[PDB]
């Protein structure tokens, strides 16, 4: 068969949360979540820990790699030697690189042939999960849950944040959930069966 | 002893402690609680904890904290003492009076 | 709200020392915050009070 | 009338580039010209004929019932050009005016109904507007570079390789091109289903269906505000550093007079036995040799081209000594946002902001000093002030999702802290066709 | 969107203002009843309040959801409030001041740049009336626009400790307030206040007109008096306790006379100079609206 | 003891898909 | 030349009591409280135009001195130090200044120091060439005589 796709598990996204911490801020109190609630909520809480001065949404440097010619070290994409003056060397830190960089995002996204396969999963018993996580979990989840702020609910000691996230969660318009879900595509077979996560 | 509830295998004890706990007149609790003094600031903020301690030591600890809490010693007071022990026209400068 | 305890980072402290007469110039003036200050010595508060 | 409301119209060039080939492809009669004797019923017959709601302008002033028809039906007139547009319509109410219009991108999807022949969106147009004007040689360069990034041997492409004339590169620029049978005369024929194959009907920019499918996602990613971090334009203003927020752009105060920068303003002049770089203020024409004592001036500076160092420096001196607020729109910069603990790794002289080459990306840093703890009650007073000159002209913290994850009095939120937007957490559902969707807002 | 009641939003039970009195809920008026005053030799004499500047901060677009209510209530009443004069929040306020702005001010006290439907929000006309004056809080620090931080408090005293005759006279003896009290009564009072949805009171104070607003002033006078009381304790030169017959009586001295006190204390919330400028400007605007 | 800033960003863990020989249903 | 105080400036006798340290926006600023309105001014920049008259520098905090000078610069204060005694030498334009009196010493010296101010007489300064490009920079005098 032609290698039309690129089978992968626990897919990496285009955007990722970057975060800067002020390291002198730590809560004196120490949370003690259950091991399973830490397996689920943990990467999130470790990322959005106390003293996080900012939490940005950057393009994934790990996905738009230098192999694609992108350079995300400053906030924008920057691709050298695309849109350049002809007949003289292009200047360094040229603004044109930004536009050049956008093409590489567009192009690199135009040709993403990744096709997800389920990674390692976990099916916690409901009794080992703190109740909010049980409301959010859907029977099972990939071991590599990445961060997502809705997870911080009843977990960050930063009170205003927890109050606000609780508000947005309890609002009808938004509903965080995680792991396996009932897709219209469920039971459809393609050598292996499809499921939605 | 209130902690022993649903924990000691000695059944009569657990039954009796359960009775005293469920009675309205007594209510064991532990750790941080809403003191009238909450949010009061004294360089650091005050909070209240329901410790497992004797009420005598607790009473004395409370008295000490409220003592430091009420004194209202500012820098101006100390400046006043320094001026009392200084040659008559000395000028003192520095911290906010409050 | 808390009083800082670890030594915080501070803006660089430019020390103008204005005289009887001077020729002020602002080419290569700093753009990020600086603390301008006019006197050479200002750790004047030395009598610590235990 | 709302800016969206009014008479829609476009230049003929846009028409041939985008509307027309698609009209040929659906097999409809070419849309009618609208001369002075054009009743609304004729236009209605044409719109129903072409299924596209477009009519090319012909000649003569257009009568008013036709105008009300085009306005109410949102019919897209095509005009040869935009000179004296008002003269082409009879102004009954005299409300229409040459300067009273709203230019805007209009996706082909909003006029064509058939989805088979539409691939992209306004997004491509936006991204193109971001591009420099491109020579064919430059375009070949971009293409060969994109090949290089993707490990393709692009050699001898777009190039004749004659035995005797040698290699001859031709242009690679074929924007919006189509595969088309030609008469032996060499001129093109409209795509006939009778002869030419259906695969030749519409090139779809020569990409796989799937690459188009992904291309839509990519355009939505590029045109997302959160990815737009190439800011342009800074305000230079002499101010004490107060506001913690990086996104602080100080307001120009009340008495200030806007002045476009121009070389004619600053000049040499004799002034108290010196050859001072005098500024003249256009509202009064008065000359001000010294930077001190000058009237408040919101001086915009569109280009730092020929601006001499004496003048640049004199302007900055006016910013300080006279509280001029200058706004340099020429600058383009990335902006790192520092936490107070990391301070400022970089240090921008005024001279560097007034002499950085146009088109070079400046890199500015901005404090978010919100996470800065209160001073000790017995810390020594700070005699002098903390001043700041460089400010953004636009919001900077656009990638920001959460801000100041710390308590204030163990309940109250710090002023300026930001909880994540609700959409970050929606995880809705797949649509009937399988598109992603946010959850319903109202139940219905 | 909430249509504004003819009596103002404050008539809704959704916006009832209340304060704990030794931990039990009570209307502000029945706290103010506990207050007792001892006049002294000095006399507050209110000056005419200078008319507020017409210059709103430029309505620049800003990222995020400004939480304006929390900003105002914190800067006035919150313990050790910070960054009270950061300009962005009031840029959004002046954005609300525009005739047909897309921004909406939710009952939450938040401002949302989008028309985000799910959250109920105040009628845009009323908030336009509100922002048209209270965006001016955005120039509390700017030197040209700073409020007199001293004389304005005389009005504070007059609206707090003033007898109806003392109020009509326009002058009152400087007073020393006192009341039977629980420990930390002032801080807990400020916590109870800082949770008030004062945006209903201010949107009503700005938008209401004629007999409805006049009835509104007679109705909410105890709330305004209470906010005034928390501010007065924030500026009181000195605050103490007296131990009469087992009961402790908190004594703040003196009402109506700002002391520019900046260092914090156990007894009360304490303004830094920034909070003083802010509170001053707030008082100027709020009394200018209050007396018309 | 001096204050310090820091940063983090969530890591990629995108492994190419594993080849299990075990089957999960009849 | 003794510069006049510009109209709209307000006289303020110096007193130690006029200045104090105080909190102001996360810094312990040396606030100045203007005696007429009573308003505090945490920073030098916004202060009302003030013709401060320092009858006696003694007892003054050095930080208060730096604040007053910084007010002269950033708020255009005109401060008149009456304590000082000084000799003066009228230097010719050809020779230029040789000695500069730092405002630091003018503010913090003991009473009875005898300062030696210099003063250019600029009447004979050479006229610039008609075509020569402008110089960058501005000459500034900070200290002035009260008397001829």
CA dihedral over E154, E159, E160, E163, signed as positive or negative:
positive
CA distance D75 to D8: 7
Question: Do the bridges between strand E111-112 and strand E36-45 make them parallel or antiparallel, or are there none, so unpaired?
Answer: unpaired
* Nearest beta carbon to residue C20 from set G108, G118, G138: G118
* Residue G84 φ then ψ, to 5°: -70, 135
Radius of gyration of chain D measured on its C-alpha atoms? 30
User: What residues does D168 pair with on adjacent strands?
Assistant: D160
**Total count of residues recorded for chain F:** 26
For residues C13 and C35, give the distance between their C-alpha atoms in angstroms, rounded to a whole number: 5
- Residues contacting E239, CB < 8 A, separation 6+: E186, E233, E250, E251, E252, E253, E265, E267, E268
The residues that bridge with D366 in the sheet, in sequence order, are D337
How do strand E24-26 and strand E19-21 relate by DSSP bridges? antiparallel
Whole-angstrom CA distances from E71 to A42, E56, F15 are 32, 18, 47
Helical packing angle, E68-77 and E185-194, nearest 10°: 160
Paired tokens of A144: 């590599």
Other beta carbons within 10 angstroms of residue E120's beta carbon come to 12
Burial class (CB in 10 A: 0-12, 13-18, 19+), D271: middle
Q: Is the dihedral of CA B43, B46, B52, B56 positive or negative?
A: positive
- What residues in E contact D243, CB-CB < 8 Å? 83, 85-88
Q: Residue D120 corresponds to which tokens in the numbers above?
A: 């992209």
Q: What is the DSSP letter of D250?
A: P
Handedness of CA G6, G7, G13, G18 (dihedral sign): negative
Q: E-assigned strands of D321-376?
A: 325-338, 362-367
Look up tokens 């088979």; give the residue.
Answer: D116
List Cβ neighbours of G142 (8 Å cut-off, separation of 6 or more): C18, C19, C20, C21, C22, G72, G103
Q: Which residue of E has its CA nearest to G22?
A: E262
Q: Is A32 exposed, middle or buried (0-12, 13-18, 19+ CB in 10 A)?
A: exposed
Q: What is the CA radius of gyration of chain E?
A: 19
CB E57 within 8 A of CB E103: no
Distance CA G85, CA G56 (A): 12
Question: In A106-133, which positions are buried (b, 16+ CB within 10 angstroms) versus exposed (e)?
Answer: bbbbbbeeeeebbbeeeebeeeebbebb
Which pair of structure tokens corresponds to residue F26? 């009849």
Nearest to E81 by CA among E283, E228, E271, E268: E271
Q: Which chains, if any, share at least 3 CB pairs under 8 A with chain G?
A: B, C, D, E
**Tally of structural domains, chain G:** 1
* Matching residue, tokens 């009070």: C49
How far apart CA D48 and CA D340 sit, in angstroms, is 64
Q: How was this structure determined?
A: cryo-EM
Among D290, D314, D384, beta carbon nearest to G70: D384
Whole-number Å distance between alpha carbons of A35 and A41:
10
Closest CA to E161 of E16, E264, E37, E53: E37
Look up residue E177 and give its two tokens: 């307030």
Residue E154's Cβ-count burial label (10 Å; 0-12, 13-18, 19+) is: buried
Chains F and E, touching by 3 or more CB pairs within 8 angstroms = no
Angle at E85 between CA E79 and CA E88, to 5 degrees: 120
Q: Within an 8 Å CB–CB cutoff, is residue B72 touching chain G?
A: no
Which of A19, A22, A29 is CA-nearest to residue A159? A29
Going from the C-alpha of A26 to that of each of D179, D264, D381, D409, the distances in angstroms are 66, 58, 28, 14
Contact by Cβ (8 Å): G41, G34: yes
Option in G16, G22, G60 nearest B96 (CB)? G22
Neighbours of G48 (CB within 10 A): 18
Which contacts qualify for F13-19: CB closer than 8 Å, 24 or more apart?
Answer: F13/A10, F13/A12, F13/A144, F14/A8, F14/A9, F14/A10, F14/A11, F14/A12, F14/A114, F15/A8, F15/A9, F15/A10, F15/A119, F16/A6, F16/A7, F16/A8, F16/A9, F17/A7, F17/A8, F17/A9, F17/A117, F18/A9, F18/A117, F18/A119
Name the residue facing E149 among G25, G29, G39 (closest C-beta).
G39
Instruction: Tell me the residue range of the domain where D77 lies.
Output: 1-113
Interior angle at CA E157, CA E156 and CA E161, nearest 5: 130
With beta carbons less than 8 A apart as the criterion, state whether G72 and G79 touch.
yes
Looking at beta carbons, which residues of chain A come within 8 Å of F15?
8-10, 119
Dihedral sign, CA of E103, E106, E111, E117?
negative
What is the C-alpha to C-alpha distance for residues G79 and G60, in angstroms, rounded to an integer? 14
Residues pairing with D430 in the sheet = D436
Q: Which residues contact D261 (CB under 8 A, 6 or more apart)?
A: D299, D300, D301, D302, D307, D315, D326
Q: How far apart are CA C20 and CA G98, in angstroms?
A: 11
**Per-position DSSP letters for D77-134, written without gaps between them:** EEES--TTGGGGB--SSS---TT--------GGGT---GGG----HHHHHHHHHSPP-
Chain D residues within an 8 Å CB radius of B43 = 377
The single-letter DSSP state of residue E68 is H
D356 contacts in chain C (CB < 8 Å): none
Q: Do C24 and G137 touch (CB under 8 A)?
A: yes
Provide the 10 A C-beta neighbour count for residue D48: 9
3-state class (DSSP) for residue A140: coil
Taking the CA of residue A142 and the nearest CA in chain F, the distance in Å comes to 12
Residue among E20, E18, E282 nearest E153 (CA): E282
Q: How is residue D299 written in tokens?
A: 């001086």
Distance separating alpha carbons of residues E287 and E148, to the nearest angstrom: 13
Inter-CA distances, A184 with D220, D430, E145, E148, Å: 25, 8, 63, 67
Which helix (DSSP H) or strand (DSSP E) does residue D259 occupy? Answer: strand D257-260
Q: Are strands A141-142 and A192-193 parallel, antiparallel or unpaired?
A: unpaired
Handedness of CA E87, E90, E95, E97 (dihedral sign): negative
Distance from CA of G86 to the nearest CA of D (A): 27
What is the spatial distance between Cα A23 and Cα D398, in angstroms, rounded to a whole number? 24
Question: What is the DSSP pairing of strand D54-56 with strand D76-79?
Answer: parallel
Residue G145 structure tokens: 């005589």
Q: What is the DSSP code (8-state) at residue A162?
A: H
Give the count of beta carbons closer than 10 Å to the beta carbon of residue D94. Answer: 8
Tokens (6 digits) for G147: 């008397």
- Residues of B with Cβ-Cβ distance to C49 under 8 angstroms: 78, 82
* φ, ψ of residue D226 in degrees (nearest 5): -65, -20
Structure tokens at E36: 């007792």
Q: Which residue from G44, G54, G57, G142 is spatially nearest to G108, judged by alpha carbons?
A: G57
Three-state SS string over E6-58 comes to CCCHHHCHHHCCCEEECCEEECHHHHHCCCEEEEEEEEEECCCCCCCCCCCCC
| Three-class secondary structure assignment of chain G | CCCCCCCCCEEEECCHHHEEEEECCCCEEEEEECCCCCCEECCHHHCCCEEEECCCCCCCCHHHHHHHHHHHHHCCCCCCCCCCEEEEEEECCCCCCCCCCCHHHHHHCCCCCEEEEEEECHHHCCCCCCCCCCCCCEEEECCCCCCC
Q: Does B66 touch chain E (CB under 8 A)?
A: yes
Contacting residues for A76 by C-beta, under 8 A, at least 6 apart: A98, A101, D227, D229, D230, D334
């Amino acid at each position: 068969l032609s290698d039309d796709f690129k089978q992968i598990s626990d897919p990496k996204g285009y955007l990722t949360y970057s975060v800067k911490y002020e390291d002198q801020f730590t809560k004196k109190d120490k949370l003690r979540a259950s091991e399973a609630d830490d397996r689920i909520v943990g990467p999130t809480v470790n990322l959005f820990k106390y003293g996080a001065a900012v939490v940005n949404i950057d393009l994934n440097r790990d996905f738009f790699d230098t192999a694609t010619g992108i350079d995300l070290t400053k906030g924008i994409p920057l691709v050298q030697d695309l849109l350049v003056p002809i007949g003289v060397t292009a200047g360094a830190e040229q603004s044109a690189e930004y536009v050049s960089g956008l093409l590489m995002v567009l192009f690199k996204v135009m040709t993403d042939n990744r096709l997800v396969i389920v990674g390692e999963t976990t099916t916690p018993m409901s009794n080992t999960l703190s109740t909010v996580v049980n409301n959010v979990l859907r029977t099972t989840y990939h071991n590599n849950v990445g961060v997502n702020p809705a997870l911080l609910r009843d977990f960050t000691q930063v009170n205003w944040l927890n109050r606000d996230i609780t508000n947005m969660l309890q609002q009808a318009g938004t509903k965080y959930g995680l792991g396996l879900t009932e897709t219209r595509l469920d039971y459809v077979r393609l050598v292996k069966t499809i499921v939605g996560h | 002893p209130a902690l022993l509830r649903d924990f000691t295998q000695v059944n009569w004890l657990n039954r009796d402690i359960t009775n005293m706990l469920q009675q309205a007149g007594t209510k064991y609790g532990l750790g941080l609680t809403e003191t009238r003094l909450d949010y009061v600031r004294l360089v650091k903020t005050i909070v209240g904890h329901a410790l497992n301690i004797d009420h005598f030591a607790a009473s004395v600890l409370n008295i000490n904290l409220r003592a430091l809490m009420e004194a209202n010693v500012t820098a101006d007071d100390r400046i006043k003492a320094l001026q009392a022990h200084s040659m008559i026209s000395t000028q003192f400068h520095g911290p906010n009076q409050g | 709200d808390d009083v800082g305890i670890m030594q915080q980072k501070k803006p660089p402290t430019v020390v103008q020392s204005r005289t009887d007469v001077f020729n002020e110039q602002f080419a290569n003036e700093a753009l990020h915050p600086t603390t301008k200050v006019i006197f050479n010595g200002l750790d004047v508060n030395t009598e610590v009070q235990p | 009338d709302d800016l969206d409301e009014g008479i829609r119209m476009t230049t003929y060039d846009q028409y041939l580039s985008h509307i027309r080939e698609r009209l040929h492809i659906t097999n409809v009669p070419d849309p009618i010209y609208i001369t002075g004797a054009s009743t609304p019923d004729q236009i209605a017959a044409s719109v129903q004929a072409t299924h596209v709601a477009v009519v090319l302008y012909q000649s003569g002033v257009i009568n008013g019932p036709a105008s009300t028809y085009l306005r109410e039906n949102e019919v897209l007139v095509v005009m040869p050009d935009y000179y004296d547009v008002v003269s082409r319509f009879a102004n009954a109410n005299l409300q229409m005016n040459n300067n009273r219009y709203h230019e805007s991108v209009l996706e082909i999807a909003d006029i064509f109904d058939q989805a088979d022949f539409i691939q992209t969106s306004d997004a491509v147009r936006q991204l193109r507007a971001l591009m420099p004007t491109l020579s064919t040689s430059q375009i070949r360069h971009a293409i060969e570079r994109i090949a290089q990034i993707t490990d393709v041997d692009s050699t001898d492409y777009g190039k004749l390789t004659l035995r005797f004339l040698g290699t001859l590169t031709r242009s690679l620029k074929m924007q919006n091109a189509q595969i088309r049978r030609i008469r032996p005369d060499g001129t093109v024929l409209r795509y006939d289903d009778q002869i030419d194959i259906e695969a030749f009907r519409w090139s779809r920019y020569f990409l796989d269906e799937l690459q188009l499918r992904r291309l839509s996602v990519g355009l939505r990613l590029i045109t997302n505000p959160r990815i737009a971090r190439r800011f342009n334009g800074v305000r230079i203003m002499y101010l004490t550093d107060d506001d913690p927020d990086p996104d602080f752009v100080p307001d120009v105060p009340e008495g200030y007079v806007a002045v476009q920068y121009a070389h004619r303003l600053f000049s040499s002049s004799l002034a108290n036995k010196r050859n001072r770089v005098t500024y003249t203020h256009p509202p009064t024409g008065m000359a001000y040799p010294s930077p001190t004592g000058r009237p408040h001036v919101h001086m915009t500076i569109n280009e730092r081209a020929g601006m001499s160092k004496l003048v640049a420096d004199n302007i900055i001196a006016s910013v300080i000594k006279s509280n001029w607020v200058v706004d340099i729109l020429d600058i383009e910069y990335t902006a790192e946002v520092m936490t107070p603990s990391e301070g400022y790794t970089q240090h921008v002289d005024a001279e560097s902001i007034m002499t950085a080459p146009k088109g070079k990306l400046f890199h500015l840093q901005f404090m978010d000093g919100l996470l800065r703890p209160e001073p000790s009650a017995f810390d020594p007073p700070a005699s002098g002030e903390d001043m700041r000159l460089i400010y953004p002209l636009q919001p900077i913290s656009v990638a920001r999702s959460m801000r100041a994850i710390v308590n204030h009095n163990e309940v109250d939120r710090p002023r300026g802290a930001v909880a994540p937007s609700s959409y970050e957490m929606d995880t809705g559902t797949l649509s009937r066709n399988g598109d992603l969707l946010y959850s319903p807002v109202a139940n219905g | 969107m909430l249509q504004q009641p003819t009596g103002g939003y404050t008539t809704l039970e959704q916006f009832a203002f209340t304060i704990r009195n030794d931990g039990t809920n009570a209307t502000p008026t029945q706290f103010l009843q506990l207050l007792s005053y001892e006049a002294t030799e000095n006399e507050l004499v209110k000056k005419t309040i200078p008319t507020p500047e017409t210059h709103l901060p430029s309505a620049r677009n800003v990222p995020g959801n400004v939480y304006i209510e929390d900003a105002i209530t914190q800067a006035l009443f919150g313990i050790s409030a910070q960054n009270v004069n950061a300009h962005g929040y009031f840029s959004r306020l002046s954005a609300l001041a525009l005739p047909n702005t897309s921004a909406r001010l939710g009952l939450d006290g938040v401002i949302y740049n989008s028309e985000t439907i799910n959250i109920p929000f105040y009628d845009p006309a009323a908030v336009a009336n509100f922002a048209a004056t209270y965006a001016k809080l955005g120039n509390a620090s700017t030197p040209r626009y700073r409020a007199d931080m001293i004389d304005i408090y005389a009005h504070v005293g007059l609206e707090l400790a003033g007898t109806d005759a003392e109020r009509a006279a326009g002058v009152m003896p400087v007073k020393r307030a006192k009341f039977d009290s629980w420990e930390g009564s002032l801080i807990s009072l400020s916590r109870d206040v800082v949770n008030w949805k004062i945006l209903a009171f201010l949107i009503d104070l700005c938008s209401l007109e004629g007999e409805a607003l006049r009835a509104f002033k007679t109705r909410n006078r105890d709330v305004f008096r209470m906010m005034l009381f928390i501010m007065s304790t924030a500026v009181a030169a000195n605050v103490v306790n007296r131990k009469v017959t087992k009961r402790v009586d908190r004594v703040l001295e003196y009402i109506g006379v700002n002391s520019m006190r900046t260092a914090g204390r156990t007894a009360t919330i304490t303004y830094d100079l920034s909070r003083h400028e802010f509170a001053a400007k707030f008082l100027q605007l709020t009394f200018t609206r209050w007396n018309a | 003891k001096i204050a310090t800033a820091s940063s983090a960003r969530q890591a990629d863990v995108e492994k190419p898909a594993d080849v299990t020989f075990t089957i999960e249903n009849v």
